[PDB]
């Protein structure tokens, strides 16, 4: 379907193609780099564990992937409230050569009533990134669950300097939801439309992708979603999108 | 045994207590930190994968392990000849908070006749260590095998700024040998006695530790081996040494 095909095409261009598994290997990351060069155009990025960034950058720069960004994760997936540890991991991610770092918000601390440590952790990790590395903040909306907490995590993250707010780690029972997307992009519209949104997990197919893009278009404008403002964090979405486009 | 127990005690004080397994976890690294606080005194260091450095430092600083160093590995275990990758990994190790980085020498390239990349990779990684992180260079002497190659990798590494030269990754068939130790510490005595030596893997027991220390004593002097100049890289030696000390 043309509406569906347009969504599939845009979703691929906005994808953070991800592999974050305990049994990941250089070989598997190399294969992911090749997969990022899709028949429908390059994805926006790949997302991998920090130690695989050097071989991924080497590989992308060998296969025409020079403009595919490398994102990684820190404070992950636990979202513990030790700022020092999150900062060290973020510094290492930057040193490996990450273009983007997706850090996990201390959501358990927020749920216990501590708003300060979330703000300070994001602020400290953004400082470790600098002006030239993107920081995405995973608020784990699927666990926060409560709309007020989702909103508060989003506000704290943006005030602390987040470049993106991201729904989920993909490691818990509930990942990206439309309900969370509504809240988070509303907060973005209220505070700073330069801040991006990243639904991660929970995006089945092109139809689901279209739904998330539809919320963005509605709240922030038809042209708002771009690689600089919107990413799909996905490990098993691309093949379905390619089938929607009748490829692979 | 008196001489044996003295060797065991010293070997513990010089140990880089190591865990480098594909199934390593935060929990296993925390347990290793506690194990480094041995009944015979603290080990010199622990050696773990870079991503575990932050939780290891937090743990050591909680449990009286403040003076136990954290070493890690880069370009590991392959010793590939891509300098850019080895340097990025070394920069990351430093950023994680490593006190020491054990980088693998491009030993296959040397066996193919390329001395240049060995020198250049060690030199670049030493630069990435900055001022506050020392560099150990793993030459994989058990694979180099030939005395000329073991000597050459040692010389190249030291000229390139290595703070230690280290026999092995522990991930190949042959690790530390007494023959390699002889050659490597002879090169140290020739060039710079401030450079350290680290036999890694294949140190069986107190008797074997005593043999390696005996080589150091003969080539460099009775008082030469210290935490700043000698480490045992070991993942399964400590329990044996404690049994020798009857602990
Ligand atoms: Cl990692
Ligand atoms: Cl690692
Ligand atoms: Na982690
Ligand atoms: Na490695």
Residue numbers in the entry:
A (entry chain B): 1 to 248
B (entry chain A): 1 to 247
Task: Quote what the paper states about this structure.
The 2-deoxy-D-ribose-5-phosphate aldolase (DERA) is an enzyme involved in nucleotide catabolism. The enzyme catalyzes the formation of C-C bonds between an aldehyde as an electrophile and acetaldehyde as a nucleophile in a highly stereoselective manner. The structures display a canonical TIM barrel fold built up of eight β-α repeats in a toroidal arrangement, with an additional N-terminal helix (α0) directly adjacent to the C-terminal helix α8 (vide infra). Furthermore, all DERAs investigated in this study form constitutive dimers.
